[PDB]
Amino acid sequence: EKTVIKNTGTISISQLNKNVWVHTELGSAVPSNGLVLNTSKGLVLVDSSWDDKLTKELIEMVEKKFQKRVTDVIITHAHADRIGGIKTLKERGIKAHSTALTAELAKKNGYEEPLGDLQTVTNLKFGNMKVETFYPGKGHTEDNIVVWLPQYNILVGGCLVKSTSAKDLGNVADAYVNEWSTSIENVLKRYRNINAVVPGHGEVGDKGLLLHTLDLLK
Ligand SMILES: O=C(O)/C(S)=C/c1c(Cl)ccc(Cl)c1Cl
Ligand SMILES: [Zn+2]
Ligand SMILES: [Zn+2]
Known part of the structure; x- marks a missing residue:
């Protein structure tokens, strides 16, 4: 059984491996997932949380537990569950990475701006931790990216990828339902061997979540 650690219970981290954890917060009631990467040069998060209060608590929880600082965050699109803690x-002085499009949309919607440094494919390295970011096209939003850990074949699907418990696509106001399928296929083509898939909301699964999302798009 995987190690799970809670704050009230509104913040929980679950261990996937030695240096990779999933962080989950309760907002709005809607749970949301990101990633915590424990590296030799600091903590790196994939995505922040619903607001600054949760993001502060999240940072402080992991900094205390892993006894190092959060140095970087990768923001995977410009909705509040992802970017709500950008002010924090x-x-x-935490570097907030994003595509230029994510940054533009963030600014347009009144959030403080992340760096806009991520390209269609960007390869980062934090200590020994390798991180690839990939823009597969439009889906849940026009800007959604995925994050790949090549040393673990772990994919962070973000809100582009629906969990098994999701029986519909959710809010599609900002979505592109006719391109979303092609974007999933682009992910499946790039990462042909996947061990775990972390959805934006819900339980961790595998490649099956990508197939589940394709079915929901029909
Ligand atoms: O279904 C999802 O993954 C997301 S992020 C839903 C959503 C939207 Cl579409 C706008 C705004 C906000 Cl706050 C949220 Cl949570
Ligand atoms: Zn969203
Ligand atoms: Zn979401």
């Missing part, structure tokens, strides 16, 4: 990141 900026003021603490």
Whole structure:
């Protein structure tokens, strides 16, 4: 059984392996997932949380547990569950990575701006931790990216990828339902061997979540 650690219970982290954890927060009631990467040069998060209060608590929880600082965050699209803590990141000197499009949309919607440094494919390295970011096309939003850990074949699907418990596509106001399938296929083509898939919301699964999402798009 995987190690799970809670704060009230509104914040929980679950261990996938030695240096990779999933962080899950309760907002709005809607759970949301990101990733915590424990590296030799600091903690790196995939995505922040619903607001600054949760993001502050999240950072402080992991900094205390792993006894190092959060240095970087990768923001995977410009909705609040992803970017709501951007103010906290900026003021603490935490680098908030994103595509230029994610940054533009963030600004348009009144959030503070992440860096806009991520290209269609960007390869980062934090200590020994390798991280690839990939823009597969439009889906849940026009800007959604996925994150790949090549040393573990772990894919962070974000809100592009629906969990098994999701029986519909959810809010599609900002979505592109005619391109979303092609974008999933682009992910499946790039990462042909996947061990775990972390959805934006819900339980961790595998490649099956990508197939589940394709079915929901029919
Ligand atoms: O279904 C999802 O994954 C997301 S992020 C839903 C959503 C939207 Cl579409 C707008 C705004 C907000 Cl706050 C949320 Cl949570
Ligand atoms: Zn979203
Ligand atoms: Zn979401």
